[PDB]
Design a protein around this ligand. Sequence first.
Ligand code: MN
Ligand code: MN
Ligand code: MN
Ligand code: MN
Ligand code: MN
Ligand code: MN
Ligand code: MN
Ligand code: MN
Lengths: 450, 450, 450, 450
Amino acid sequence: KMERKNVWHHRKKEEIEAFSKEYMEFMSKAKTERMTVKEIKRILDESGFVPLEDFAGDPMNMTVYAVNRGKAIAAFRVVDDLKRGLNLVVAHIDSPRLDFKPNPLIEDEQIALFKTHYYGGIKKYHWLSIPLEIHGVLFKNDGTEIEIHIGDKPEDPVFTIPDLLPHLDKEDAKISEKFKGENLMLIAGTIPLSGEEKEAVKTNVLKILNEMYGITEEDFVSGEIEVVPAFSPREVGMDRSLIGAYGQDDRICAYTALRALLSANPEKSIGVIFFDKEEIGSDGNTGAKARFYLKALRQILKMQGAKDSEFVLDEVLENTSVISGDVCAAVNPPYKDVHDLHNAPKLGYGVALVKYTGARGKYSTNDAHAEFVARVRKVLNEQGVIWQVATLGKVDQGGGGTIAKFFAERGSDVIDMGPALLGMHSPFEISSKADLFETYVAYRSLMEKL
Amino acid sequence: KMERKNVWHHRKKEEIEAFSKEYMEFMSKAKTERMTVKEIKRILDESGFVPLEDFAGDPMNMTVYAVNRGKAIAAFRVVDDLKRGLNLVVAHIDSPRLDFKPNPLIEDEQIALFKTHYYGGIKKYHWLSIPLEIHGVLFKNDGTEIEIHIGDKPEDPVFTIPDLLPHLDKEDAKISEKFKGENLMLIAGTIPLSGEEKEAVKTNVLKILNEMYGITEEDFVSGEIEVVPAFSPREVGMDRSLIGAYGQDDRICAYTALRALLSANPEKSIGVIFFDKEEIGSDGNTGAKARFYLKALRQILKMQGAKDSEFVLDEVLENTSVISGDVCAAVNPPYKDVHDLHNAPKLGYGVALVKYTGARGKYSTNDAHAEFVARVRKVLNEQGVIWQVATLGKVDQGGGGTIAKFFAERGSDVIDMGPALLGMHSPFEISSKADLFETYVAYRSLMEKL
Amino acid sequence: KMERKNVWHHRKKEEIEAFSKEYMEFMSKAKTERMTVKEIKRILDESGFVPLEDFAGDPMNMTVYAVNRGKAIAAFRVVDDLKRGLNLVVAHIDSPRLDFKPNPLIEDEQIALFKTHYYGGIKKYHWLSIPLEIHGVLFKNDGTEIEIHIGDKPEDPVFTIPDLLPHLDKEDAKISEKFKGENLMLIAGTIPLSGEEKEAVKTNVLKILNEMYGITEEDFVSGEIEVVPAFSPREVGMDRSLIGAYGQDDRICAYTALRALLSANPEKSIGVIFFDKEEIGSDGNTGAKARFYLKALRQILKMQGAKDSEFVLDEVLENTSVISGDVCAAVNPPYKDVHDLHNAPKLGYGVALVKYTGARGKYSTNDAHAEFVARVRKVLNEQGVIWQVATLGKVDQGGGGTIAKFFAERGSDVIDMGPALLGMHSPFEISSKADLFETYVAYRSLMEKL
Amino acid sequence: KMERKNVWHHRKKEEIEAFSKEYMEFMSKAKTERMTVKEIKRILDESGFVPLEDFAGDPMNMTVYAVNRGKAIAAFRVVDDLKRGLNLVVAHIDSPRLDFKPNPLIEDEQIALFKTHYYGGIKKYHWLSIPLEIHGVLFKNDGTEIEIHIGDKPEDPVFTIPDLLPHLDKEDAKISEKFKGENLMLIAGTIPLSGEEKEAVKTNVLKILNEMYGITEEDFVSGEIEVVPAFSPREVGMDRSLIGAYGQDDRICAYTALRALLSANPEKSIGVIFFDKEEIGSDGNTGAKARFYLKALRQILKMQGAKDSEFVLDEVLENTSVISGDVCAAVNPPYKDVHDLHNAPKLGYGVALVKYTGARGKYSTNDAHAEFVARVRKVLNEQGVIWQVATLGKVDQGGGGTIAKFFAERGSDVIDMGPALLGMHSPFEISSKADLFETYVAYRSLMEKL
Ligand SMILES: [Mn+2]
Ligand SMILES: [Mn+2]
Ligand SMILES: [Mn+2]
Ligand SMILES: [Mn+2]
Ligand SMILES: [Mn+2]
Ligand SMILES: [Mn+2]
Ligand SMILES: [Mn+2]
Ligand SMILES: [Mn+2]
């Protein structure tokens, strides 16, 4: 008994392949959280969703969405009274990146550089000597919004933070020292602008930016630009069983959840909420823990006749099951020693059910209740969903931490659930096509029969 | 001339003893938060309490309780308009222990073992070579609930995590290294099944668990089992002045508070709330950071006719005095240099009044206001309660942190109060019978006089 | 070819179980070398034995015994003249423990304390924060003997050596440092006698001790009090195949040898000798090398007509096969590296036959001769006794040393043999019921057939 | 209320003083075991003792002595059937010193030096730059015996091992390094012989030793010379309360015992045995591990008509109480943290009753039984002897180990008793005049009352 089935042996190859190409197409547009919101919203508009604010026409049946500030977005399919509660799948759309500084442009030794400040649990050495592209937006003083996208197009140049050749790198310190956040600067120019006696190369770059976007240097301050890997999603492996791409840290869950939401046949209200800032603690007004979430829900309660928002919300949240959809780590052979094999997920064996994460003895982590796990286990088994238990490394390996805790905090039962990755947080995260497909299945089954 | 008074010299040996036996009897039942709740409930059911969800009586005079998820519980004796506030004593009913992994059963070197994942700030070396009890619940796929209690009965076997004999335990690492969470596995069985050629021993335990609970290996995933010391409460010392027992960390405060709640003659509404998860940060929907707390008060308010829950709450919490009932550290002679003797509690000298905890200089902790302490100082003195001021060690020694900050965060004045233990977080914590009693006396008078 | 059999597959579950209940009854009586001698003495008395000191019958068929100083005891069943030598199995009845110092009572920080001095190879951290009980004897200045047994009964208070709470335990030292033998003091009392200007608590404890035993502080000098863990023997495991108890380190070999002595049907004289002082190197009056052993044999020889004691003895010992009892170490999965699996004993695979108890290349050990092992191997095999070979860990892992050498030194052939333990020297040692039984089965065979 | 009594307040200053001068006079003679024996003999010859080999008197009333090899001696006052046992006090007459190598004379940098090989646990740095005496015997090939005593007479020169002046003694190593045995060489001479062209200085010393003792260089091989401090016994302190002297380590016990043997009025046979070699393990035919001890008793037994020596011995040793007379360590104020003040002896507070020594928890040491201590406690108290309990430092501090275990090994009950020194093993050990006296008083009463 107690054996894990391999998805490739219980699901249609063609179905997996198809769903796989749709995912990667999406991962081609979703490099930042602003692009993911944009890309999700249009998929919603395309599927007949309308802004919750603009909705008119009977609650008890309304498919709407609420965009936070371009950084977060919540989509619901209200099918009944919210006091009946709902099935939610929460995920995050921010991934480790680089981020320009308020004053990014500088020149050092006749070379224009863009200074950055890493974001999230990055691994410095991953971002040295690889083709990067930049995305983001800048506002002119008058308030004109300027979008930037350089590197995603073949006629576009890419950027780079060149490593030091090994011939003159005569000094090996701990991975800690060596690789300083400050030296993560993209080369921006090198060509001096004839006639300038002070920082000719920097000036020239500003000249190009001004002729190209009508922007001036002070416009970087009132703007945000993210540096990401130019690698495009690709199939991986001789058997083409895996997917390689940047930002799979939850965009893989966001995508699957989105899809599950669009094909589900609910019984009670359902929805998905994609948050930002999770990679740095979920602070700010666009991450989990922000009033945003309960505000969207309160808005609905009023349209449904709720007299006392907060009181009614108590039942809404009392009922309502939340699936914290985030990723975990798959046993990586050369480093199998970091896991407890009897509780570590394997690529291809299905969605991982992660009861508790955290660190040093379940510190600051949400631990799902046996009653909830039971209810989740029953729906999955009845729907023939293929899943596997998943722990975040041997007892004291570390890591741990999702957004699930911020939801149990509001009174709802939550459980972490998603596919296992390889090389998480790197510029090219690996995932299994089959698991990617089964997560979608799982989320849909839970949204429906939970 | 300010000096501390010894409770034994001011309270009647026979009343302390009676209270001790009642406490120890309670402690023989409350070994986990689930068992504690169930035990606190039957005591509440007697005494005449009814669920808040099934009240239907006079909203101005109700003695009710709310059970979160079998892991937390709130009990109030509402005898006025809650707008006038409550007098609440709060504590936690969870203690450092060992939890079974989702997949706990494995076999190694022909021996069945149950893997664990320690919960809370335990001292790993305490759990090696001591009798252990298994407690918890398992859910079979169909939904069936199965309670497990093994080792707490004379006709029951116990479990152990045998340490390595000193003869081959060469090489002495720091306490950090040595003693690794991963190695905290209980021996499940050693007898192999006849005919079985693959894990004959693990197969046997499964055969046994099945002929006993009708469960299969996978039921552990949708289960929550906790390992606890087989030690039962006992008197300690030649003068029988102390109590040795597992989980005194707050269940001692929970008991004294519960008792004070039942004995009190309150002028205003009083109540006690017992939380889960504090030993890991209070995260989770059963922690003192979850909606549950304010959910219950809002519930009571509507029954009293509140029209705008939130607004009415601002006042309820504005008034209302919360007593954070948690234990502090008494001076352990051999390690007395860890304390500031002029600000450290002593066994037998009364309840400890703990103004602020935290570390490195009041970091992340509630620091009682001088005026709130003043009100407390006056009640205790007026009723002749034996108390003493306590601190959690010398300035930069260690780090405390109770749930007090979670209620102060909600607008109420809060202070930490409880008995002083010796060997906190170990399998056999020590407390003073005299302090036990006086804590109850303190909680009751504060409930009635604040 | 060549494979160990599991005793559970070749022995009646009813026999093993019953013999186990009896051994456990015994272990709840033998917690110190004195109580063990006392216990063994009555089992002998009830079985027909009488003191060698006052035997009268035929010196060719005598079943006597000789207690040394209430700490050691030799029991023989002379069935022929000792010149034919006899078959003996020797074990030790002392176990690592804590001893009260001559002046054990002191007070510090208003806490009565009992200073100890550990005995044998204990792991100091094992004794912190666990229930303890004291057993021993004190003599008044007039010669009166006072027995002390506090903690072995429920009504009795138990003692403890509270560890420091993790919160304030800062310095991360290595096992060597930290856990100072000096800090292993039991808490004596905390209540202060009113009216006492100095050391009020200590006076109260002496006041309690004097009303209970009429003793005075000086009576501890002419006394011997041992500190033993409070917990009693319990079955262990889901399959209940193991036994957990303090002092299994040879009280187990002594018990099985005893029972084997009573039910054996000898062909030549046989006997069992239980020694003291083994955990410290067998020094003193009651040790394995304390003259007591040969004094008993000479006595018996003289009762048989021995003219030149020492000369005759030369032959008595020339013949005479000695089986050194004592336990060995089983493989503890998480620490299996410590062992050479091909030469290490497994729990439940029979009596361990240890040829030598090395230490860095067999220093100071009794390596049994091939021809003597062959003799033993023939008997065990022919009698169908299940056994396995066992070495005390990998080559330079650690030390070892049974009393066997003290007997080979006297001219006899010796060989180490007993069951395999887990967590040796801890307060809760683990052993297999099956092995417990086969050791008894093995001793009985060898006595009857060597 | 238990408290120690100060001998100076209970024994008569004039009797202590008289005893002190007699002791110090003895100590001026006994500087080595060979000199001590010779000195103990003439005192025994007076007082009326005769060699055991030349007795020929009443076997039931003999006061004899046995000299081992001029290095050990036994003296008994047999006044009954030895079967009734003896009351023996044992001590050693050897002390830490420096021995001449077999070939001790060498020359280096034009200076004759005598190489040495330290004996016993000395502190090398004590022997640098202090006056030294040379004592011992040399045998010329023909067999002639030549006693050497140089430095103990005013008209004698002394020797020295000059340390390096601090000015060039750069580099500070641990006490281990620095101070090397090999470098403990006494300056023999510095004057060169006229005409000599090879080692003119070593040649001179040889010429001198020859015109003085008629010896040649090779006679040192068949010789045994010991280097000893030139310091002579002296009163110490303003109150003249102490005694400073070399070799107090036991010669203080040997003296007090000898004196008690001569003063006593015994009920049963009493005696004292003085051993050699204890300072290195008691190995050798003059140590307390050699046949000598039992050889003498067997001798006495035959004279009493014993037919079977060994058998009769079992009883002799069965009865017979042995007092291990050796010194313990008094608290040295500046280094008082090395002791457990509640169990450490103090100068002037009587003989120390030392139950067990050894290290790491009673390893390799005799641990007196409670009943034996009881008998001792009673005699001392009954005769009003001032005594105190002593321990050799805190639990894991150091390591003791007296010859007590060698007699307990032979069947007799044994306990350690002696005065408390300060600076043991140094060239000038300190003892208390009051303790000196009281030791003698204790030994005598025990001899007469046990
Ligand atoms: Mn991440
Ligand atoms: Mn994530
Ligand atoms: Mn705690
Ligand atoms: Mn607590
Ligand atoms: Mn042992
Ligand atoms: Mn042993
Ligand atoms: Mn010495
Ligand atoms: Mn000595």
